Design an enzyme around this catalytic site. Structure first.
Site, PDB file in Angstrom:
ATOM      1  N   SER A  67       0.780  -1.237   0.000  1.00 36.51           N
ATOM      2  CA  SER A  67       0.000   0.000   0.000  1.00 36.51           C
ATOM      3  C   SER A  67       0.816   1.294   0.000  1.00 36.51           C
ATOM      4  O   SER A  67       0.243   2.382  -0.088  1.00 36.51           O
ATOM      5  CB  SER A  67      -0.942   0.015   1.195  1.00 36.51           C
ATOM      6  OG  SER A  67      -1.806  -1.106   1.143  1.00 36.51           O
ATOM      7  N   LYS A  70       0.051   3.499  -2.816  1.00 33.37           N
ATOM      8  CA  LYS A  70      -1.041   4.468  -2.803  1.00 33.37           C
ATOM      9  C   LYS A  70      -0.561   5.921  -2.795  1.00 33.37           C
ATOM     10  O   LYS A  70      -1.283   6.816  -3.236  1.00 33.37           O
ATOM     11  CB  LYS A  70      -1.952   4.208  -1.603  1.00 33.37           C
ATOM     12  CG  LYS A  70      -2.642   2.851  -1.701  1.00 33.37           C
ATOM     13  CD  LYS A  70      -3.493   2.544  -0.481  1.00 33.37           C
ATOM     14  CE  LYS A  70      -4.015   1.108  -0.559  1.00 33.37           C
ATOM     15  NZ  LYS A  70      -5.399   1.068  -0.062  1.00 33.37           N
ATOM     16  N   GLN A 123     -10.960  -5.085   0.552  1.00 33.45           N
ATOM     17  CA  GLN A 123     -10.607  -5.826  -0.667  1.00 33.45           C
ATOM     18  C   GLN A 123     -11.829  -6.062  -1.551  1.00 33.45           C
ATOM     19  O   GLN A 123     -12.951  -6.058  -1.064  1.00 33.45           O
ATOM     20  CB  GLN A 123      -9.981  -7.171  -0.318  1.00 33.45           C
ATOM     21  CG  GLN A 123      -8.805  -7.085   0.665  1.00 33.45           C
ATOM     22  CD  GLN A 123      -7.506  -6.579   0.029  1.00 33.45           C
ATOM     23  OE1 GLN A 123      -7.455  -6.282  -1.169  1.00 33.45           O
ATOM     24  NE2 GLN A 123      -6.449  -6.482   0.838  1.00 33.45           N
ATOM     25  N   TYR A 153     -10.755   2.195   5.033  1.00 26.90           N
ATOM     26  CA  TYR A 153      -9.567   1.905   4.234  1.00 26.90           C
ATOM     27  C   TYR A 153      -9.905   0.846   3.198  1.00 26.90           C
ATOM     28  O   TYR A 153     -10.441  -0.214   3.529  1.00 26.90           O
ATOM     29  CB  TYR A 153      -8.432   1.457   5.155  1.00 26.90           C
ATOM     30  CG  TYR A 153      -7.055   1.334   4.520  1.00 26.90           C
ATOM     31  CD1 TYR A 153      -6.442   2.432   3.903  1.00 26.90           C
ATOM     32  CD2 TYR A 153      -6.345   0.140   4.586  1.00 26.90           C
ATOM     33  CE1 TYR A 153      -5.171   2.331   3.354  1.00 26.90           C
ATOM     34  CE2 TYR A 153      -5.075   0.029   4.036  1.00 26.90           C
ATOM     35  CZ  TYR A 153      -4.494   1.129   3.422  1.00 26.90           C
ATOM     36  OH  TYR A 153      -3.233   1.018   2.876  1.00 26.90           O
ATOM     37  N   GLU A 274      -0.575  10.000   5.010  1.00 27.71           N
ATOM     38  CA  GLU A 274      -1.248  10.246   6.273  1.00 27.71           C
ATOM     39  C   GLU A 274      -0.287  11.038   7.163  1.00 27.71           C
ATOM     40  O   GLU A 274       0.911  10.755   7.183  1.00 27.71           O
ATOM     41  CB  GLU A 274      -1.663   8.915   6.919  1.00 27.71           C
ATOM     42  CG  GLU A 274      -2.824   8.221   6.170  1.00 27.71           C
ATOM     43  CD  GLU A 274      -2.959   6.737   6.489  1.00 27.71           C
ATOM     44  OE1 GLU A 274      -2.660   6.331   7.631  1.00 27.71           O
ATOM     45  OE2 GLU A 274      -3.340   5.963   5.580  1.00 27.71           O
ATOM     46  N   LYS A 312       3.349   6.255   5.565  1.00 31.22           N
ATOM     47  CA  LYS A 312       2.497   5.278   4.907  1.00 31.22           C
ATOM     48  C   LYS A 312       3.080   3.877   5.095  1.00 31.22           C
ATOM     49  O   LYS A 312       4.266   3.622   4.813  1.00 31.22           O
ATOM     50  CB  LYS A 312       2.341   5.592   3.415  1.00 31.22           C
ATOM     51  CG  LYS A 312       1.266   4.762   2.717  1.00 31.22           C
ATOM     52  CD  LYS A 312      -0.117   5.097   3.263  1.00 31.22           C
ATOM     53  CE  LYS A 312      -1.189   4.135   2.747  1.00 31.22           C
ATOM     54  NZ  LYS A 312      -1.131   2.798   3.422  1.00 31.22           N
ATOM     55  N   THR A 313       2.247   2.974   5.586  1.00 26.15           N
ATOM     56  CA  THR A 313       2.618   1.572   5.680  1.00 26.15           C
ATOM     57  C   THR A 313       2.226   0.870   4.394  1.00 26.15           C
ATOM     58  O   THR A 313       1.324   1.323   3.671  1.00 26.15           O
ATOM     59  CB  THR A 313       1.914   0.856   6.846  1.00 26.15           C
ATOM     60  OG1 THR A 313       0.493   0.928   6.643  1.00 26.15           O
ATOM     61  CG2 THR A 313       2.281   1.495   8.181  1.00 26.15           C
ATOM     62  N   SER A 315       1.980  -3.430   2.895  1.00 27.07           N
ATOM     63  CA  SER A 315       2.202  -4.847   3.173  1.00 27.07           C
ATOM     64  C   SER A 315       1.598  -5.731   2.086  1.00 27.07           C
ATOM     65  O   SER A 315       0.531  -5.434   1.547  1.00 27.07           O
ATOM     66  CB  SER A 315       1.607  -5.231   4.543  1.00 27.07           C
ATOM     67  OG  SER A 315       1.837  -4.238   5.546  1.00 27.07           O
TER      68      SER A 315
HETATM   69  O1  IMP Z   1      -7.779  -8.331   3.414  1.00 24.41           O
HETATM   70  C1  IMP Z   1      -7.309  -8.019   4.514  1.00 24.41           C
HETATM   71  N1  IMP Z   1      -7.889  -8.486   5.685  1.00 24.41           N
HETATM   72  C2  IMP Z   1      -7.293  -8.240   6.909  1.00 24.41           C
HETATM   73  N2  IMP Z   1      -6.110  -7.527   6.974  1.00 24.41           N
HETATM   74  C3  IMP Z   1      -5.534  -7.065   5.830  1.00 24.41           C
HETATM   75  C4  IMP Z   1      -6.115  -7.299   4.585  1.00 24.41           C
HETATM   76  N3  IMP Z   1      -5.331  -6.722   3.639  1.00 24.41           N
HETATM   77  C5  IMP Z   1      -4.277  -6.136   4.251  1.00 24.41           C
HETATM   78  N4  IMP Z   1      -4.387  -6.347   5.603  1.00 24.41           N
HETATM   79  C6  IMP Z   1      -3.473  -5.884   6.650  1.00 24.41           C
HETATM   80  O2  IMP Z   1      -3.782  -4.538   6.963  1.00 24.41           O
HETATM   81  C7  IMP Z   1      -2.567  -3.848   7.378  1.00 24.41           C
HETATM   82  C8  IMP Z   1      -2.402  -2.575   6.575  1.00 24.41           C
HETATM   83  O3  IMP Z   1      -1.962  -2.843   5.245  1.00 24.41           O
HETATM   84  P1  IMP Z   1      -1.004  -1.825   4.478  1.00 24.41           P
HETATM   85  O4  IMP Z   1      -1.657  -0.454   4.475  1.00 24.41           O
HETATM   86  O5  IMP Z   1      -0.851  -2.372   3.057  1.00 24.41           O
HETATM   87  O6  IMP Z   1       0.303  -1.909   5.232  1.00 24.41           O
HETATM   88  C9  IMP Z   1      -1.431  -4.867   7.237  1.00 24.41           C
HETATM   89  O7  IMP Z   1      -1.231  -5.512   8.494  1.00 24.41           O
HETATM   90  C10 IMP Z   1      -2.003  -5.869   6.237  1.00 24.41           C
HETATM   91  O8  IMP Z   1      -1.417  -7.160   6.269  1.00 24.41           O
END
Ligand code: IMP
Length: 358
Positions: A67, A70, A123, A153, A274, A312-313, A315
């Site tokens: 992400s 983004k 998602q 989000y 953010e 911004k994170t 994953s």
């Molecule tokens: O579909 C999902 N369900 C639950 N957690 C999620 C999902 N997609 C991403 N995450 C988690 O949400 C957090 C934020 O994601 P990020 O903004 O991409 O870092 C990370 O811990 C991800 O692994």
């Protein structure tokens, strides 16, 4: 390595002290860290990028940044605004005739970009796996909250923003990013789709079962979580967000991404980025990047008035990224790993390191 000269960089002890415990606690195969201080980039690299080749991580190694993508998608959208191809207050259906007649008649581009369209989920449903199925999904989607009232989000949300923004500029998203945006940011080792002559630099991500994996194709993946980049290129993006760039439109677009729209607790939502008042407590940084803010719907509050920290994170199944920087102090940090380890651990380390740099 007894008897070897220790590396000369004065910042190495501070970074090591925060990063090495991280690598052993969460069994991270490799991490590229890059730090900005006093107009200079410092790179610290740990472990292995690919267990098959045994090749070490460097600041040239490509990681999936999830992400964090983004922020780049937001910058592309801001670019479309600067160029006059769209406005954040445009209804989304202005940039997509197939949306006319749906709820997106009454939802703005800005709301899509800031996850506040009204309850778009994190998602796509797993069933939505083609362009045609995607269009059907958006046309049938029922708003849960009124536009602008809640932050949820969402990849379908920022994903649709990026898609329509590229369409307003009359070019597909991936070539627009790779041929226009990224070069203008000086990110010449950053890709939506990693080309053959760069595949060797592409790390493998590793699951909790230590199996090698890379991100899977998904709808609007390019827009929402599809960028591969190195620590050095992401640090260049940080510098672009501090000192700017030569392309004048891109300069404006960068500034537009920093503008706050609303807040959730101590976090203010910009385009992609953010932000927080700086200096910022560890608990505030943790709260703004907590499960509560990430996973559930939160009411929007007044944005912080325009020193600031931006972060911004990002994953994926196999990768974990984090970027944060403070323009007023000319400091920043990029942390890219090939394991998805807890967001709390990223923030604690980054926060500790930034405090020393300051
Ligand atoms: O579909 C999902 N369900 C639950 N957690 C999620 C999902 N997609 C991403 N995450 C988690 O949400 C957090 C934020 O994601 P990020 O903004 O991409 O870092 C990370 O811990 C991800 O692994």
């Amino acid at each position: 390595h007894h008897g070897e000269a220790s590396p000369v960089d004065p910042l190495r002890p501070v970074v090591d002290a925060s990063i090495q415990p991280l690598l052993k606690e969460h069994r991270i195969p490799g991490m590229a860290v890059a730090v900005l201080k006093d107009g200079k980039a410092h790179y610290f690299n740990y472990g292995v990028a690919n267990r098959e080749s045994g090749a070490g991580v460097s600041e040239q190694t490509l990681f999936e940044i999830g992400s964090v993508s983004k922020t780049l998608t937001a910058t592309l959208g801001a670019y479309a605004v600067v160029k006059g191809a769209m406005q954040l207050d445009d209804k989304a259906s202005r940039h997509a005739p197939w949306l006319k007649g749906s709820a997106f008649d009454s939802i703005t581009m800005g709301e899509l970009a800031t996850y506040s369209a009204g309850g778009l989920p994190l998602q796509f449903p797993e069933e939505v796996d083609s362009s045609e199925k995607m269009r059907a999904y958006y046309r049938q989607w029922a708003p849960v909250y009124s536009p602008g009232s809640h932050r949820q989000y969402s990849n379908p949300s920022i994903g649709l923003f990026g898609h329509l923004a590229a369409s307003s500029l009359k070019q597909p998203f991936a070539p627009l990013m790779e041929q226009t945006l990224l070069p203008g940011l000086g990110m010449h080792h950053t890709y939506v789709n990693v080309p053959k002559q760069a595949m060797a630099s592409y790390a493998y991500g590793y699951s909790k079962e230590d199996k090698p994996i890379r991100v899977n194709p998904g709808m609007l993946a390019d827009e929402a979580y599809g960028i591969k980049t190195s620590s050095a290129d992401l640090l260049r993006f940080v510098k672009a967000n501090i000192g700017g760039v030569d392309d004048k439109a891109l300069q404006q677009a960068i500034s537009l991404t920093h503008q706050g729209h609303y807040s959730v607790g101590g976090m203010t939502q910009g385009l992609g980025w953010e932000s927080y008042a700086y200096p910022v407590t560890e608990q505030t940084l943790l709260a703004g990047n907590s499960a509560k803010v990430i996973l559930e719907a939160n009411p929007t509050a007044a944005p912080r008035e325009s020193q600031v920290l931006f972060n911004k994170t990002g994953s994926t199944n196999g990768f974990g990224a984090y970027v944060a920087f403070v323009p007023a102090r000319g400091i920043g940090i990029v942390m890219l790993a090939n394991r998805n380890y807890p967001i709390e651990a990223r923030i604690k380390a980054a926060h500790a390191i930034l405090a020393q740099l300051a």
